Symmetry: D2
Subunit: 458 residues, 4 copies
């Protein structure tokens, strides 16, 4: 069986929805059983995120009806351009019903001045709940029968932890397999699940790709297709190297090491379940359906495969004599960053144990600076002597499964970096010699990636 | 003001105590103000540890009586060999006799009750230095200079009550010692020990004597701290591994810090810190080779790579995670789990995928770590750590040097060399201060690597 | 003068107008605090829960229409078209606020302690303006406020808010310099950020007192449907006469948990600054009434019906074994109120009394604290259901030899066996426990002998 | 089988030890199986307490040598008085010396290290009983019966690890003593102490020598437990207060416990519990009047049995705003006094619950005041703290008081007539005890009055 995910851009308008359905229908004639996972229409989640704060703060009753008319029109148009007056009618009722529902809650949070995380998750869920019926209708508007379902209905049962729910148990087989055994293409809302007692929950960032992975995992599928707006994964950002090419084949392991925080396509949560059961992931371009795309797979003669970059980040060094194991000073650093919700991109601590270096995003520096002040306070008194911060810095990451055991490669990567005129500020390579991460000045980003790419990829 | 510290081997016998007395006297002629810091005679601190546990466990007074006879002899012979003057010789003997009597009662005490609390554990170890110092002080008086012996607490080291590894609370070194110096007196301070508000003796821990010298120096604003040992300064690497290893003439505070790995021989970060803060140079000298120029640890001039440190037989732990990102404080909980369980972590690296953390610990701590980790998480549908892996029989090399900062090419040159040596790099950690590069290779390739590395970057 | 009016005192529009003339009569010599109408606060509670559980669209609509015509007819028979106008809308607005808040909880399905308190306040905000109205109608100037506007600053603790600051004179004085009577909706207070809080049961009295405290007022009047504090419950003894003068400390000792007229919290502020409290009947304003202020032996006899007597027996229960601490610890959680405590010189057992609907609650609590001589440190607990508390009260008893002897002999002669005795160090109150069968004969005898 | 307990005064000298041995011997003609629980000789436990304290503080070696000289001279004197036989005298002296040497060691130890752990504190205390035990065992031997001295733990009393006042964990009493009793051997067990699971000596606390007898009796299903003291049973009321005070011939388990205020001489609640549980009778007898009939605590049972008194005590009133049951206000009062270990003699709370009234020993007032404020108008919630220090507790005990209408009235009128004002009353559900407090000066005329009207 084939599970097929599409995101917000791919279902950006009625036209694109109709095009998605065409893609779906085409695959259905090659594969009997097809489950489609669908995101909210582009820029709907965000519209939803802000009215939620709009209702809580400014609290205007009309500003809500103003938002309602907007979603109404946005999706009314999609129905007109995706779909047959017959199907147009049934879908229009589903849409009206969800919109009535949506209005109420917003009116409620306005009236009370209260937006609990439970309420917050209910709002966001409407995005995908208004997308899926329109797609389902379009599938139906061609050859195949199709129904739309919520993540709960689909068998994704979660925590009570709203906004970022953990999945307890998958009941994917029980709900979908009967519907598949009957010919139906179920179109499942991505990004959302339910709790035992019926409450609607969201799955955080990368959620739709995650739902695709869970469904794929539960049904023990033959393949999971992540349909996006680029032709798979490139060897490096084409905005930096114009001659970059699609990677035909990636190992889960390699895909994992490329799936950094804030990456557009790859995420560890989507990859891990597919890796566990050995299910292939295929990244495809809905705007270029014929492209071979990137296959993330189990089997695997290259050394370096890809070069990922994280631009505009900051470098934080924590100085402190002692800082030696007899004191859980590291434990306290990360707690102070744990609270305050500061994401640590790289950690590096050398032999002396007198300092640890970290890279965070440049909007988190001051956030994490006051955090470390609150935990420690700044010889005869405390244990952090000094903190250092380097702004406008960047993380380059060289990835390839063939790097493991390959004597000499680090030497080559770094000699190259130097040959391009870049000074290495920090290096971090973990025990699975599959990823070498390092830090250089932003000025040198462009010339350094050009060289590495020229030397190691092409 | 010159602080001069002497360890166990430099004061390991009477002859030796007299030798370090002449060194102290010789510097007293160039520099008017000298404070000395001395450890117990070699083997003594160890001997005191064994008798403690023995008195607790077997509980035999005859063995205590025996131990006292060993201690008395050793120190009597020392006096008889350090000091020519009979009148001085009797003053020191007097002091020693007090301490033996006091030490005996504690030991008989612990045998009788079968209770060895940390407090008593510290009071006992204390006797090591409280028996050396008066002899060194005697040998100095014997040579013509005014001198008396003091305990660390008596000299201004006021500490926490955390016996065994006490933290320093107040530094009152200027209050006690300066009046002594002004009279022309060489105070000799028992290194490694402090005191508490109520006057309970405490110990400072591993490298305590060195720490005492640093505290005196910091407290006084000494012109120089001199650490006298049995080797001629800091070497470019372990001479056992490279026979043609040379003494580093000059070293920076950061370099020294970066060379002072946990469990190191001469350098410790506790010691280097106070000196760094007030900009007091540190000089490491050889007591048995007092002509060597040794290693000056000062402010900062050319050199890329200065030294290579090594850490034999450690272990590499990789923790593969479910997400392990900035929304789930997994890193916080890892280091907390190993904090409790008292597990010291030598290296850390986390790559940009944020999906794994690699750390190296000591190979006796592996089992402690795995148990500790399994306690905090307990190993798709179950927990937040996917799996943990371990590599035994590995080692850490660190290349250290201030000139490496901004030295485009050096990291490339180092790792290519390592590779040329016939070695695969298992993990890299280099920090924002481009002064140290640490990596991990198999124990198999330690010797070959350090040889090649030293030949190409030092000599 | 701070006159307080309650639920049944403002029961209908007539009642409100009757109340309105009373205040007008007071003003001739020289601040009025008001509660809500009868069974209105009890209704808001049920509609709150209604709108949380069933959250029914039709079942809410009928509620506001109820309190529409409840208050619409209250305007009819309480109030000239000068003043009838500025209540209709002045209450329609407050209703559509309540309706929106109510439909607010109906849509979201979440009732915070904050939302509850905001809902509960409406009761008083629906009653107050109407009274303010009939004060104007009778030719006297009047304004209707709100606890917070009057300066009752409270905790963040919704339902039972601890008072933190008082802006007494600072908000009320200028209105008094104008001839306006401030008609203040009591029971409710505020946060520093304007969020309405409630004070708990016996709150409208507290509010009245708090006004008195900060102003250092001349008098505090509590207007109810009984002619003051009686010598005993008149429903049991028909010969029960009213108490004219009651000591501060005496009124406190006559106030048990769940009592009607008196309240220790409300008594407290008045006892501090030394402000008299008068209680008078609204159905008979001519009556003398009880005056709580700063002779004779026994003053009054209070009674608590339908209680239970737990007895905790354990060998040990001494000093180092702090199970006394744990009995109450278990009873503190599970929200169990203890009426009486006794422990003899042996320290082996402790006797308590609680409402006889708390036993199973209190037992389970005790069992989840001790494993119930080689096991736990408590041997056994025993209970006596259908039992009652009688308390004799008088400051004249303090240092008066004989009264206790005589009291218990009087009890004896009524045919009653005493199960438990507790007398505090102040000697103002004597409290003992007897079978329920005996309560009627016992109180009558006691009152027959020591009051009349 | 019979267990027989003797206290410090009853073995206050060697002659008295022989006298006890004579008592134990006489009893062994009647009952074939007797076990004896013995305390330390009079004044020895006290001597041990202040010396082990002394060794901690002054750390004076010479003052230890005096204590041993003292203890040795006391017990050698005792041995020579109690025993006639030279060979027994010889073997008892050898025991006593080995024990005293052990004592010296530990006392030296505490002085040398300046440390007195609760564990060591217990080991030292255990010596008093370990020194008197073998003298008495020897004394029985000299009179013709087979006997061994045993430590409480060797007898099967296994306890906590909470030194100084341990709780019992298991009884191996039957396993240890039954093979001895089947051979005419009189085990004399050191009262007051027991062992830890890993063989560490622990003490049982105040009244712990009586409790030993009880634990033995429980563990052996004894037929009779005998507490031998220096008074002919338990009196109706303190003899020092009423001259013509008679011995109470019989007492119930429940009456016995109401008479046992924390500090009482003979009766202790913890001692009564086991005997109550298995229905084993307790007989209290007079070692200096062996012909008395004493007081029997028992099952099988006109109105008021006894008047109990607690002298020179104090009472505290806790006035507060609201102080309702809704909040955990009462809990915190007792937690506060739980820490700093303050014993509450009486508690009282009226229907107002605005105040609570407790009684504590007068030498705890400040020790209770400070700790209360350290736990805690509009600022706090506890308003006042009144206090007296010129008071006592009187408690009238009788089983036949329950359901006896009018007795409380009769009692408080009697108090009233004697010339005393009642400051507080407390009566429990089990109407076996009415406790109350009056001015100290009134105790004499009050107790005398109560005794007149309600005893004979
Ligand atoms: C994110 C991806 O799945 C989607 N097609 C998009 O680009 O919006
Ligand atoms: C600093 C060192 O790691 C690197 N070779 C550089 O200078 O760029
Ligand atoms: C450690 C050093 O200072 C000492 N002299 C030694 O050789 O032991
Ligand atoms: C660095 C590491 O990835 C590789 N095995 C090397 O030694 O070059
Ligand atoms: C509370 C009281 O004042 C009111 N009149 C009532 O009886 O309801
Ligand atoms: C005196 C005494 O009998 C009574 N209880 C009193 O009021 O003090
Ligand atoms: C037990 C007896 O010897 C002791 N004198 C007492 O009366 O308590």
């Amino acid at each position: 069986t084939t599970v097929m995910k599409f995101g917000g851009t791919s279902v950006g308008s009625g036209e694109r929805i109709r095009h998605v359905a065409k893609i779906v229908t085409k695959r259905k004639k090659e594969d009997d059983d097809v489950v489609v996972v669908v995101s909210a229409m582009s820029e709907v989640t965000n519209a939803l995120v802000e009215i939620s704060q709009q209702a809580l703060d400014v609290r205007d009753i009309a500003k809500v009806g103003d938002f309602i008319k907007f979603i109404r029109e946005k999706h009314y148009k999609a129905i007109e351009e995706a779909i047959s007056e017959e199907i147009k009618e049934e879908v229009k009722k589903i849409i009206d019903s969800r919109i009535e529902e949506l209005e109420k809650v917003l009116i409620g949070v306005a009236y009370l001045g209260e937006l609990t995380p439970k309420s917050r998750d209910y709002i966001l869920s409407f995005g995908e709940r208004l997308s899926s019926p329109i797609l389902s209708g379009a599938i139906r508007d061609l050859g195949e029968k199709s129904i739309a379902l919520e993540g709960g209905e689909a068998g994704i049962i979660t925590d009570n932890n709203f906004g970022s729910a953990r999945v307890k148990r998958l009941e994917v087989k029980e709900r979908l397999l009967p519907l598949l055994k009957e010919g139906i293409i179920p179109v499942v809302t991505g990004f959302i699940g339910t709790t035992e007692e019926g409450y609607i929950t969201t799955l955080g960032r990368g959620g739709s790709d995650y739902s695709a992975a869970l469904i794929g995992y539960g049904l023990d599928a033959d393949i999971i297709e992540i349909w996006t707006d680029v032709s798979g994964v490139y060897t490096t950002d084409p905005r930096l190297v114009p001659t970059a090419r699609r990677i035909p084949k990636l190992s889960y392991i390699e895909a994992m090491e490329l799936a950094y925080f804030g990456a557009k396509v790859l995420h560890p949560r989507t990859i891990e379940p597919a890796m566990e059961k050995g299910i292939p992931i295929l990244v495809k371009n809905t705007f270029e359906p014929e492209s071979e795309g990137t296959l993330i797979t189990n089997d695997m003669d290259s050394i370096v495969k890809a070069i990922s970059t994280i631009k505009n980040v900051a470098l934080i060094n924590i100085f402190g004599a002692g800082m030696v194991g007899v004191s859980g000073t590291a434990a306290r650093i990360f707690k102070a960053l744990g609270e305050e919700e500061v994401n640590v991109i790289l950690i590096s601590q050398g032999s002396s144990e007198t300092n640890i270096s970290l890279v965070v995003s440049e909007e988190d520096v001051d956030k994490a600076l006051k955090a470390l002040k609150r935990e420690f306070g700044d010889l005869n008194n405390n244990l952090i002597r000094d903190v250092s911060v380097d702004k406008d810095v960047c993380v380059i990451s060289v990835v390839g499964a063939g790097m493991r055991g390959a004597k000499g490669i680090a030497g080559k990567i770094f000699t190259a970096v130097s040959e391009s005129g870049a000074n290495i500020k920090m290096i971090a390579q973990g025990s699975s010699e599959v990823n070498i991460s390092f830090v250089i000045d932003e000025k040198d980003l462009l010339n350094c990636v050009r060289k590495l790419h020229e030397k190691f990829i092409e």
